[PDB]
Amino acid sequence: QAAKEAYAALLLAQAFDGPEVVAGAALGVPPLEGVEAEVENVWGSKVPRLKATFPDGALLSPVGTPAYTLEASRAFRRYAEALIRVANTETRLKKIGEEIKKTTR
Amino acid sequence: MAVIADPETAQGFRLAGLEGYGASSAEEAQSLLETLVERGGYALVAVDEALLPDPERAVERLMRGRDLPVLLPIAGLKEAFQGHDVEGYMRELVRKTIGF
Amino acid sequence: DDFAYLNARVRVRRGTLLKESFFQEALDLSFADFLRLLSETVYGGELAGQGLPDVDRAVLRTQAKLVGDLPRLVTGEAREAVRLLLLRNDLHNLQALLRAKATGRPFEEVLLLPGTLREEVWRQAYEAQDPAGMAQVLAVPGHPLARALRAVLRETQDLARVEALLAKRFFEDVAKAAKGLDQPALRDYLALEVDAENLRTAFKLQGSGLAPDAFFLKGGRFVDRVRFARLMEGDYAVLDELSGTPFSGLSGVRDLKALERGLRCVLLKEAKKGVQDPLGVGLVLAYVKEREWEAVRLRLLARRAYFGLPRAQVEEEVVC
């Protein structure tokens, strides 16, 4: 909710301050393995995991909208961080799938 | 990356530090979703709960296995939403683990 | 020259400014009822679609014909005085334009409205293929923001740096010209704009380990190098010693959002009591802050209504 807080409040004050916000901030996460993939052998077959941490900056874009710009930049963290939880459980889901099915089998 | 979300909320994930290629183009975002994961030239692909694919089999059969995840739940809008706690808990119990 | 006709043209326009009691009504309305309300106003008069892209566009186009047409309607000594005000809205276009040429991205997704540089100047600049040529095309309307650009472009071709040294050099340019065009009303305001900029430069770059003297430029009222250095360490006890200025209200506040909210409300206030000085640039000064702030609240009230956000999240930011 605190990610979106600023996002949704920077849409009709953005679409011409889109340019500004993306400039001061740390440039895009790599599309080829921007995330940190980890391999791990465990029962319930060899399932790979991963954690979503990458650079994106925070409270450091110069110029632009007084409050919103900086608050939107900071918000990128609340994607990253938050995403790690789902990053481990949805991969854990696929592991515990294997077990459950072989068990009842 | 790409986050696959509503047009207006997709907007805020295209900002630097993050890389999004969202927007709705269907009710489960099939139009986009499929084409995009087919290459798997994005570090992460994520599908929200304001779309979420009712046939997950459709995706798996096309991407043909993936060592990177897909369809991570993000809310997809803000309206004070936090029903994605208990919803995800039951999402789990229905398809796997114990019943009710 | 002269503001005699021009002030008069603006006085009729101050009649169709949006009073406080509109935003009061609008919060109580859903998006459907908001849309019926909006259409009564002059921003409503440029409306072209119920949805969000269309609201952003109706607002912008209203600002393009009623506010961005002011520098053309005067010349000379009048025009330089009005121009400095307009220039901030032109810098926003310039920084985005400079960035579309440099990083190779399309013309689109930028701010365009007329002000001091016309639409055609931005198109001819875009299509220019040497940064030096890009710069002469910009220098055609004449303004201090060229002269500011020109010096920075001689030192560097790095995007982030041009952006910062242009802004710093530009407010410094503005200040000297403005002091030489006189009037007490403009001087008091100018002081506040620089003081607000100083505080704000310090906040945006907070904790980057940098020099605090780089965030202080002349034009001040009570702020200095030491307050900046403490502020940079993360200490907000400096704002709690800041009174005798209308930023007395920043005391005991330590959130970036409340702090920055505070500066925009203070600047609004100075300008709104410049109507006891309507002679010369005073009235226009008050008119531009009010059209800008008004436009901002209709965009926030429209966003708040569409996505069903919490009321208090926006009720506080739509009043000073």
Whether B8 sits inside 8 A of C310 (CB atoms) is no
Distance of alpha carbon A49 from alpha carbon A36, whole angstroms: 9
User: In angstroms, rounded to a whole number, what is the distance separating the alpha carbons of residues C295 and C290?
Assistant: 8
Q: What is the DSSP letter of B3?
A: E
Q: At what angle do helices C20-28 and C31-38 cross, to 10 degrees?
A: 150
Least CB–CB distance from B69: residue in A25, A72, A90: A90
| C177 neighbors C80 (Cβ within 8 angstroms) | yes
With tokens 């506010």, the residue in question is C67
CA dist C218 and C237 (Å) reads: 23
Q: Distance, in angstroms, between A39 CA and closest chain B CA? A: 9
Point out the residue among A1, A35, A100 whose CB comes nearest to the CB of B44.
A35
Interface with C, mutate which of A5, A11, A12, A60 (most C CBs under 10 A): A12
Overall resolution, Å: 6.4
Architecture of domain C1-75+280-320: Orthogonal Bundle (1.10)
How far apart CA B78 and CA A1 sit, in angstroms, is 6
Q: Considering only CA atoms, which of C302, C293, C291, C300 is closest in space to residue C50?
A: C302
Structure tokens of C281? Answer: 């640039």
**In this structure, are strands A49-51 and A36-38 parallel, antiparallel, or unpaired?**
antiparallel
CATH number of this structure's domain C182-279: 1.20.1690.10
Q: Is residue C101 within 8 Å of residue C82, measured between CB atoms?
A: no
How far apart (Å, rounded) are the C-alpha atoms in residues B60 and B38?
A: 10
Name the region of B6 (left: φ>0; alpha: ψ -120 to 50; beta: rest).
beta
Q: Which amino acid is at A35?
A: V
A34-37 contacts, C-beta under 8 A, 24 or more apart: A34/B1, A34/B19, A34/B43, A34/B44, A35/A87, A35/B1, A35/B43, A35/B44, A35/B68, A37/B67, A37/B68
Q: After which residues is chain B broken (C to N over 2.5 A)?
A: none
CA C109 from chain centre, in angstroms, equals 19
Three-state secondary structure string covering chain C: CCCHHHHHHHHHHHHHCCCHHHHHHHHHCCHHHHHHHHCCCCHHHHCCCCCHHHHHHHHHHHHHHHCCCHHHHCCHHHHHHHHHHHHHHHHHHHHHHHHHHHHCCCCCCCCCCCCCCCHHHHHHHHCCCCHHHHHHHHHCCCCHHHHHHHHHHHHCCCHHHHHHHHHHHHHHHHHHHHHCCCCHHHHHHHHHHHHHHHHHHHHHCCCCCCCCHHHCCCCCCCCCHHHHHHHHHCCCHHHHCCCCCHHHHHCCCCCHHHHHHHHHHHHHHHHHCCCCCCCCCHHHHHHHHHHHHHHHHHHHHHHHHHCCCCCHHHHHHHCC
Measured between alpha carbons, how far is residue C201 from residues A88, C88, C128, C260 in Å? 40, 16, 32, 11
Question: Using a CB-CB distance cutoff of 8 angstroms, which residues of chain C are in contact with residue B14?
Answer: none
Instruction: State the DSSP string of A29-59.
Output: --TTT-SEEE----SSS---EEE-------S
φ, ψ of residue B45 to 5 degrees: the values are -130, 140
Closest chain B residue to C53, measured at CA: B8
CA–CA gap between residue A83 and residue B22 (Å, rounded): 17
Specify which residues B47 forms β-bridges with: B4
**Residues of chain B positioned with their CB less than 8 A from the CB of A76:** 15, 17-18
Q: Token pair 């001689």 is at which residue?
A: C154
Q: How far is CA C151 from CA A22, C98, C132, C180, C259, in A?
A: 25, 15, 11, 22, 33
Fold of the CATH domain C76-181: V-type ATP synthase subunit C fold (1.20.1690)
Instruction: Out of A54, A90, A100, name the one closest to residue B72 (CB).
Output: A90
**H or E, element range at B16:** none
Give CA–CA dist A48/A40, Å, rounded.
Answer: 6
Q: How far from the centroid of its chain's Cα atoms is residue A58's Cα?
A: 14
Q: What are the start and end residues of each CATH 1.10.132.50 domain in chain C?
A: 1-75+280-320
Instruction: Name the residue among C1, C29, C10 with its Cα closest to residue C282.
Output: C10
Which residue is listed with tokens 């632009």? Answer: A64
Q: What are residue A61's phi and psi, to 5 degrees?
A: -70, 125
Phi-psi region of C306 (alpha: psi -120 to 50; beta: other; left: phi over 0): alpha
Residue ranges and CATH numbers for the domains of chain B are 1-100 (3.40.50.10580)
CB within 8 Å of C133: residues ≥ 6 apart: none
Q: Which long-range contacts (CB under 8 A, 24 or more apart) does C91-97 make?
A: C91/C145, C91/C166, C91/C167, C91/C170, C92/A16, C92/A17, C92/A20, C93/C117, C93/C122, C94/C138, C94/C145, C94/C149, C94/C166, C95/A19, C95/A20, C95/A63, C95/C163, C95/C166, C96/A16, C96/A19, C96/A20, C97/C122, C97/C125, C97/C126
State the helix-helix crossing angle for C131-139 and C76-103, rounded to 10 degrees: 160
